Design a protein around this nucleic acid. Structure first.
Lengths: 113, 76, 205, 149, 123, 78
RNA sequence: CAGCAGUGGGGAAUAUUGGACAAUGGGCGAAAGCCUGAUCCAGCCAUGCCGCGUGUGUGAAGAAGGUCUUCGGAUUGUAAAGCA
RNA sequence: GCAGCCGCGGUAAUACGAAGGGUGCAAGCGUUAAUCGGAAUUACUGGGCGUAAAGCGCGCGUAGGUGGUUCAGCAAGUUGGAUG
């Protein structure tokens, strides 16, 4: 009777990947490439790329190589996925629309001897 | 062939307005709720009164928004 | 899809024979066997449920030669048919055409009963079936096509019919090399090393 | 009971002047596959000395479960604390489609057609009491209503 | 106000099965307090004896069926929306003593053709 | 014209027809009035070749429906 | 071209400026037929889904190459290079 | 440098990057995105509100929701069957 006069409304769940609006990947251009420091238990010098996505959105993506060359105006593809240490990043630069290099041998996303 | 309602308006010339109450079951909670229909009928003898219990059948549309007619006054 | 490669390294794992070998003998002597496959298998521990549920699915699946694409569909046609899905899983693996060429005995083991049906040597009812998944029906001939009869490893494979034990749900005329799939087995005609219901235990986790 | 079965083992602790003194707690079910089940809790400083005490206390406090023969008797519901347990019968080909702490108690009672589900709390020491009270409180023919049905 | 009288039967019964009270008296009404006849035909006997002239109070003679009572859970009533108007989709708990039914013609359970109402189980 | 014609079911190189009664203005795979029985050009043992249900084909030929030219040369198989 | 094929463009991303009216439609015709990018078909693409494909029911000859000493042992553990 | 969570890494690293050697599942295999499930985490089935979130500061009252008991009629809800 209380349920009949207003029913139970379900709560919507927002995306935790706001940019790339329901897309798997979405390319942008690197605004700035830099390093920032992890959250309190961890310590490293981890390479980020602030990218301006082609939606007009402007997010920070992670570069998960063992050394990269995204040189300050590159044309990366990003994909979803948070990096728990870096506070306020939500994306990964995929490794293979620009550069892949190294040894990796325990691969993707990699190179192929 | 027949609906049965209480007259809720008389104020139009040759037109009466009935409320037809039906108790439908709620589609998800199952409570039987009252649920209303406010039709316009045609009383050409202009003789139904506010509060009459009348019977109406369906005819061809006599005006815009008026496509039921008066059959028979049940009680008063 | 087929598993190919090393078949010595298969049988250490689960434990038994599993009949995946090369000639006229038995199980386990010339490949120095007492131990485990793995990175170091010289000390053990914890032989319990989930990893033994996954031994039990993967012991059956290396006898018969399915991959898990076909094998999970065999779980479907067990749970679709009525009653005793653990035995339904094994009757479906025993009506299989390269399995029956083994169970008739015209083939050496299943992985040369797979490769013998596939090169169009087996006929079922006067035709050619070369799918090693063709489910055979109760009362089908499973004969041999008359271009592969004088190739001697067909006949040389017929001798462990007597030495592996009689299967005793076929009959097989060795003169024309023509079997008859008499009926499907039930779960007393199958070996007891397998635990039929521990694959049903490995379904919803 | 001879088909014993451990459910959960927990490393619990206590603080003194020196620091955390530890003790292990094991919850273990003991049955016979025919309608006899107890459950037992025990504590010790070492793991197997506490499992033994959980075996020991589960061989006393056992209960005759009035089953129908490989299924439950009727769809039932029980609850101890915030843990709530629904159990029913199944037909003949089903197994134990319950899970966790209800899977052990409804294995060593010799039922194998359950279709049980637990709501509320999933803490296994109260899920075990809540399965134990559903099983202790059934009766197929021991209705005292003086009828044949 | 008091505006569900046969859930007041099933509660006066239940609270006295929860005590060890011998008799429950209550000022209840016609055929849906011959719910009490159904409940103590299929079940047991009572005297049950609706007995006055102008305050006709009925007196269930509850009895205690060896050790602990046979009413474990009763209520399951409808009053608004809480409800059974079924067409057989009605209760089957053990398939036993099933569920009092309260509608158009006669209070019964599970024997004739169909037509549900409401009540609740002996056990 | 109301017409009686064949509709393609089946698959690639394995045709299968339906003997629909349609509007002759509709598409040949949708919106029929009835289906009187099938026709199967790649039938083999156990599969019928036509099931052409001559009590409703008599109704529609009574109502003035046109067989096409193959449906006309498949009601000559009676 | 919000007909078919194809372009530039956007984008994470989605094909061939193909063949034939032979079938089943549809359109005119009295018919012959003439039309039909409907359709039936061929291209391309693991995009799905299903099936299939990579010789022996054996034997130390325990080759090397890969090792640790558990310096004998574990490791390729009823394998090959021969074959009917 | 890893990582979906717990978290790993500060000198013997089963968590990072490797030939001593293999568990998957296979013309696939992985990770992104989305969808429902597990979620009894919007609870109709099927939840809560002393202290965890949650009883309006309290009245009075309009719509509404609901309503004691008996006999009768009625037949809208209810129920059964038939037909479309």
């Amino acid at each position: 009777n209380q349920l009949v006069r207003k029913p139970r409304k379900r709560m919507v769940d927002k995306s935790d990947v706001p940019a790339l609006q329901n897309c798997p990947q979405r390319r942008g251009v690197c605004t700035r490439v830099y390093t920032t420091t992890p959250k309190k238990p961890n310590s490293a010098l981890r390479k980020v790329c602030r990218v301006r996505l082609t939606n007009g959105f402007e997010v920070s993506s992670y570069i998960g190589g063992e050394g990269h060359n995204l040189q300050e105006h590159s044309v990366v593809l990003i994909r979803g996925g948070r990096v728990k240490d870096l506070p306020g990043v939500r994306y990964h630069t995929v490794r293979g629309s620009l550069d892949t290099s190294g040894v990796k041998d325990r691969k993707q996303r990699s190179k192929y001897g | 062939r027949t609906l049965t309602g209480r007259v809720v308006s008389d104020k139009m010339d040759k037109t009466v307005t009935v409320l037809i109450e039906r108790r439908v079951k709620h589609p998800i909670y199952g409570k039987y709720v009252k649920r209303s229909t406010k039709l316009h009928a045609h009383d050409e003898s202009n003789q139904c009164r506010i509060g009459d219990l009348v019977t109406i059948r369906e005819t061809r549309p006599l005006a815009k928004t008026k496509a039921w007619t008066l059959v028979d006054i049940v009680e008063r | 899809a087929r598993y190919i490669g090393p078949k010595c390294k298969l049988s250490r794992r689960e434990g038994t024979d599993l009949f995946l070998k090369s000639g006229a003998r038995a199980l386990d002597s010339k490949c120095k066997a007492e131990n485990v496959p793995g990175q170091h298998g010289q000390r053990r521990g914890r032989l319990s449920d989930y990893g033994l549920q996954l031994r039990e699915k993967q012991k059956v699946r290396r006898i018969y030669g399915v991959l898990e694409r076909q094998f999970r569909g065999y779980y479907q046609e067990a749970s679709r048919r009525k009653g005793s899905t653990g035995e339904n899983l094994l009757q479906l693996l025993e009506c299989r055409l390269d399995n029956v060429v083994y169970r008739m005995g015209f083939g050496s083991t299943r992985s040369e009963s797979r490769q013998l049906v596939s090169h169009k040597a087996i006929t079922v009812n006067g035709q050619t079936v070369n799918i090693p998944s063709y489910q055979v029906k109760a009362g089908d001939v499973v004969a041999v096509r008359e271009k592969s009869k004088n190739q001697l490893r067909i006949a040389q494979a017929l001798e462990l019919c007597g030495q592996r034990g009689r299967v005793e749900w076929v009959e097989v005329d060795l003169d024309k090399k023509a079997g008859t799939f008499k009926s499907a087995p039930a779960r007393s005609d199958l070996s007891a090393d397998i635990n039929e219901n521990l694959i049903v235990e490995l379904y919803s986790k | 009971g001879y088909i014993e079965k451990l459910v959960q083992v927990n490393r619990v602790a206590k603080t003194v002047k020196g620091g955390r003194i530890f003790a292990f707690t094991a919850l273990t079910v003991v049955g016979d596959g025919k309608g006899r089940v107890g459950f037992g809790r025990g504590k010790a400083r070492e793991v197997p000395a506490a499992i033994q005490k959980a075996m020991e206390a589960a061989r006393r406090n056992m209960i005759q479960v009035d089953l129908n023969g490989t299924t439950l008797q009727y769809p039932t519901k029980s609850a101890h604390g915030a843990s709530k347990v629904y159990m029913q019968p199944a037909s003949e080909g089903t197994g134990i489609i319950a899970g966790g702490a209800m899977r052990a108690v409804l294995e060593v009672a010799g039922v194998q057609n359950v279709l049980a589900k637990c709501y509320g709390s999933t803490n296994p020491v109260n899920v075990v009491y809540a399965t134990f009270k559903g099983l202790k409180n059934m009766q197929p023919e021991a209705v005292a209503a003086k009828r044949g049905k | 106000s008091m505006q569900d009288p046969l859930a007041d039967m099933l509660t006066r019964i239940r609270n006295a099965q929860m005590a060890e009270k011998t008799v429950v008296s209550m000022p209840s009404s016609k055929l849906k307090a011959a719910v009490a006849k159904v409940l103590k035909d299929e079940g047991y006997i009572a005297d049950f004896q609706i007995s006055s002239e102008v305050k006709p109070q009925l007196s269930i003679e509850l009895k205690y069926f060896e050790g602990k009572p046979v009413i474990e859970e009763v209520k399951r009533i409808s009053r608004p929306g809480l409800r059974q108007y079924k067409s057989v989709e009605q209760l089957v708990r053990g398939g036993l003593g099933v569920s009092i039914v309260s509608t158009n013609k006669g209070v019964m359970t599970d024997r004739a053709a169909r037509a549900a109402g409401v009540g609740g189980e002996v056990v | 014209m109301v017409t009686i014609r064949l509709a393609r079911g089946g698959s690639k190189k394995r045709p299968f027809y339906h003997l629909t009664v349609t509007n002759s203005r509709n598409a040949r795979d949708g919106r029929f009035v009835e289906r009187i029985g099938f026709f199967n050009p790649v039938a083999t043992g156990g599969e019928v070749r036509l099931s052409v249900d001559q009590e409703r084909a008599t109704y529609w030929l009574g109502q003035g429906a046109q067989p096409s030219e193959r449906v006309a040369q498949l009601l000559k198989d009676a």
